[PDB]
Design an enzyme around this catalytic site. Structure first.
Site, PDB file in Angstrom:
ATOM      1  N   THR A  36      28.246  16.598  33.876  1.00  0.00           N
ATOM      2  CA  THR A  36      28.609  16.608  32.510  1.00  0.00           C
ATOM      3  C   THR A  36      28.521  17.933  31.897  1.00  0.00           C
ATOM      4  OG1 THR A  36      26.158  16.350  31.624  1.00  0.00           O
ATOM      5  CG2 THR A  36      27.234  14.304  32.641  1.00  0.00           C
ATOM      6  N   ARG A  47      41.841  20.766  40.515  1.00  0.00           N
ATOM      7  CA  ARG A  47      43.286  20.538  40.336  1.00  0.00           C
ATOM      8  C   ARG A  47      43.719  21.909  41.199  1.00  0.00           C
ATOM      9  NH1 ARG A  47      41.038  19.897  35.735  1.00  0.00           N
ATOM     10  NH2 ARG A  47      41.157  17.555  35.716  1.00  0.00           N
ATOM     11  N   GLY A  85      40.291  11.439  25.430  1.00  0.00           N
ATOM     12  CA  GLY A  85      41.100  12.212  24.595  1.00  0.00           C
ATOM     13  C   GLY A  85      41.584  13.327  25.285  1.00  0.00           C
ATOM     14  N   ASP A  86      42.734  13.596  25.177  1.00  0.00           N
ATOM     15  CA  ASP A  86      43.065  15.075  25.842  1.00  0.00           C
ATOM     16  C   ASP A  86      43.985  15.826  25.002  1.00  0.00           C
ATOM     17  OD1 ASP A  86      42.992  15.080  28.986  1.00  0.00           O
ATOM     18  OD2 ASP A  86      43.436  12.819  28.466  1.00  0.00           O
ATOM     19  N   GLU A 125      45.333  12.423  39.783  1.00  0.00           N
ATOM     20  CA  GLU A 125      44.514  13.101  39.061  1.00  0.00           C
ATOM     21  C   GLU A 125      43.682  13.687  40.109  1.00  0.00           C
ATOM     22  OE1 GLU A 125      42.590  15.838  37.263  1.00  0.00           O
ATOM     23  OE2 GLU A 125      44.255  14.896  36.416  1.00  0.00           O
ATOM     24  N   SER A 130      36.790  11.599  33.423  1.00  0.00           N
ATOM     25  CA  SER A 130      35.601  11.422  32.119  1.00  0.00           C
ATOM     26  C   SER A 130      36.318  10.476  31.324  1.00  0.00           C
ATOM     27  CB  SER A 130      35.125  12.617  31.744  1.00  0.00           C
ATOM     28  OG  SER A 130      34.263  13.312  32.543  1.00  0.00           O
ATOM     29  N   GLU A 170      29.993   7.623  28.279  1.00  0.00           N
ATOM     30  CA  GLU A 170      30.788   7.876  29.391  1.00  0.00           C
ATOM     31  C   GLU A 170      30.680   7.133  30.753  1.00  0.00           C
ATOM     32  OE1 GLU A 170      30.409  11.981  31.111  1.00  0.00           O
ATOM     33  OE2 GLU A 170      32.091  11.932  32.088  1.00  0.00           O
TER      34      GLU A 170
HETATM   35  N1  LIG Z   1      37.956  13.668  27.305  1.00  0.00           N
HETATM   36  C1  LIG Z   1      37.026  12.528  26.988  1.00  0.00           C
HETATM   37  O1  LIG Z   1      37.379  11.700  26.169  1.00  0.00           O
HETATM   38  C2  LIG Z   1      35.784  12.636  27.713  1.00  0.00           C
HETATM   39  C3  LIG Z   1      34.898  11.420  27.958  1.00  0.00           C
HETATM   40  C4  LIG Z   1      33.768  11.205  28.150  1.00  0.00           C
HETATM   41  C5  LIG Z   1      33.009  12.284  28.472  1.00  0.00           C
HETATM   42  N2  LIG Z   1      33.634  13.510  28.136  1.00  0.00           N
HETATM   43  C6  LIG Z   1      33.121  15.036  28.680  1.00  0.00           C
HETATM   44  O2  LIG Z   1      33.149  15.907  27.753  1.00  0.00           O
HETATM   45  C7  LIG Z   1      33.231  16.983  28.830  1.00  0.00           C
HETATM   46  C8  LIG Z   1      34.571  16.577  29.752  1.00  0.00           C
HETATM   47  O3  LIG Z   1      35.688  17.292  29.141  1.00  0.00           O
HETATM   48  P1  LIG Z   1      36.972  17.071  29.712  1.00  0.00           P
HETATM   49  O4  LIG Z   1      37.036  15.524  29.760  1.00  0.00           O
HETATM   50  O5  LIG Z   1      37.799  17.399  28.220  1.00  0.00           O
HETATM   51  O6  LIG Z   1      37.485  17.834  30.690  1.00  0.00           O
HETATM   52  P2  LIG Z   1      38.685  17.740  31.907  1.00  0.00           P
HETATM   53  O7  LIG Z   1      38.285  18.412  33.594  1.00  0.00           O
HETATM   54  O8  LIG Z   1      39.078  16.517  32.170  1.00  0.00           O
HETATM   55  O9  LIG Z   1      39.681  18.484  31.092  1.00  0.00           O
HETATM   56  C9  LIG Z   1      39.490  19.725  30.496  1.00  0.00           C
HETATM   57  C10 LIG Z   1      40.734  19.972  29.762  1.00  0.00           C
HETATM   58  O10 LIG Z   1      41.938  20.113  30.311  1.00  0.00           O
HETATM   59  C11 LIG Z   1      42.795  19.086  30.028  1.00  0.00           C
HETATM   60  N3  LIG Z   1      43.301  18.493  31.229  1.00  0.00           N
HETATM   61  C12 LIG Z   1      43.163  17.039  31.792  1.00  0.00           C
HETATM   62  N4  LIG Z   1      43.566  17.023  32.954  1.00  0.00           N
HETATM   63  C13 LIG Z   1      44.457  17.937  32.990  1.00  0.00           C
HETATM   64  C14 LIG Z   1      45.402  18.180  34.083  1.00  0.00           C
HETATM   65  N5  LIG Z   1      45.599  17.054  34.881  1.00  0.00           N
HETATM   66  N6  LIG Z   1      46.299  19.365  34.016  1.00  0.00           N
HETATM   67  C15 LIG Z   1      46.128  20.266  32.998  1.00  0.00           C
HETATM   68  N7  LIG Z   1      44.981  20.419  32.183  1.00  0.00           N
HETATM   69  C16 LIG Z   1      44.264  19.076  32.348  1.00  0.00           C
HETATM   70  C17 LIG Z   1      42.165  18.215  29.123  1.00  0.00           C
HETATM   71  O11 LIG Z   1      42.920  17.576  28.192  1.00  0.00           O
HETATM   72  C18 LIG Z   1      41.158  19.185  28.563  1.00  0.00           C
HETATM   73  O12 LIG Z   1      41.760  19.984  27.252  1.00  0.00           O
HETATM   74  C19 LIG Z   1      31.919  16.697  29.744  1.00  0.00           C
HETATM   75  O13 LIG Z   1      30.907  17.012  29.101  1.00  0.00           O
HETATM   76  C20 LIG Z   1      32.317  15.514  29.791  1.00  0.00           C
HETATM   77  O14 LIG Z   1      30.966  14.679  29.824  1.00  0.00           O
HETATM   78  C21 LIG Z   1      35.060  13.723  27.942  1.00  0.00           C
END
Ligand SMILES: NC(=O)c1ccc[n+]([C@@H]2O[C@H](COP(=O)([O-])OP(=O)(O)OC[C@H]3O[C@@H](n4cnc5c(N)ncnc54)[C@H](O)[C@@H]3O)[C@@H](O)[C@H]2O)c1
EC number: 2.4.2.-
Length: 203
Positions: A36, A47, A85-86, A125, A130, A170
């Site tokens: 986290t 990735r 959210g992305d 993926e 998350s 989460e």
């Molecule tokens: N995103 C959510 O809704 C969500 C939900 C619960 C917890 N969290 C959390 O917040 C942080 C996680 O952040 P994340 O979820 O934003 O990280 P991630 O590893 O999932 O994504 C990181 C960034 O890259 C982007 N991304 C996602 N998949 C991609 C792909 N396949 N190719 C290229 N870019 C890609 C995302 O939109 C983001 O801007 C941690 O603390 C985690 O606990 C996030």
């Protein structure tokens, strides 16, 4: 029919109940707390190497394996709808600087491109996924909102209780998961792309 939580208090209650039954080891809990705090980094390297961890530093290999193993104990007891959210890069490099207009308004041509590229297709993926039991305020404002339909019995763990951050409800999904994009539409105010997807399996 998938359960969709509409109240934070109830989501937490259900989540807490699930967590109590996991029986995660000390090592696994430790790897989850760490995930986290470094999710973006971990998922990024996953990735970047398409899931191959052989070249990762020893501790990271250890943590990834511990995270993967944790899922032997974490499954959702029911069909559930999860949220995430992305940011634009989620759709690909070509969307990083083109998805949004100057006022937070989704560029329609880009939307069509994204639709053509992902609508009714399968997506794999490499990183962990998350998600949240609800569209929590912290990520609800991102330009891309995804609603995952996760089947009963699937690997999914409510890690909120040990997460380093608050308010995210989460639910973590395993890495190397594949889902099918069933629907893609612009939100009422034209500020977001709402994605509905059906989660499948892992590696
Ligand atoms: N995103 C959510 O809704 C969500 C939900 C619960 C917890 N969290 C959390 O917040 C942080 C996680 O952040 P994340 O979820 O934003 O990280 P991630 O590893 O999932 O994504 C990181 C960034 O890259 C982007 N991304 C996602 N998949 C991609 C792909 N396949 N190719 C290229 N870019 C890609 C995302 O939109 C983001 O801007 C941690 O603390 C985690 O606990 C996030």
């Amino acid at each position: 029919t998938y359960q969709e939580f509409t109240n934070i208090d109830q989501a937490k209650a259900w989540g807490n109940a699930q967590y109590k039954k996991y029986g995660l080891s000390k090592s696994e809990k430790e790897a989850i707390v760490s995930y986290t705090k470094s999710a973006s980094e971990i998922n990024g390297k996953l990735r970047q190497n398409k899931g191959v961890i052989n070249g990762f530093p020893s501790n990271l290999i250890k943590q990834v394996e511990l995270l993967d193993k944790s899922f032997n104990k974490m499954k959702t007891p029911e069909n559930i709808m999860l949220f995430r959210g992305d940011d634009p890069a989620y759709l690909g490099t070509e969307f990083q600087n083109t998805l949004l207009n100057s006022n937070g308004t989704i560029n329609k041509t880009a939307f069509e491109k994204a639709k053509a590229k992902f609508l009714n297709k399968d997506r794999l993926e490499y990183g962990y996924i998350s998600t949240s039991l609800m569209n929590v305020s912290q990520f609800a404002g991102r330009p891309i909102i995804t609603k995952f339909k996760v089947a009963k019995g699937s690997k999914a763990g409510y890690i909120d209780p040990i997460s380093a951050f608050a308010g995210q409800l989460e639910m973590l999904l395993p890495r190397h998961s594949t889902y099918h994009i069933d629907d893609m539409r612009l939100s009422s105010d034209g500020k977001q792309i709402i994605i509905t997807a059906t989660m499948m399996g892992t590696a």
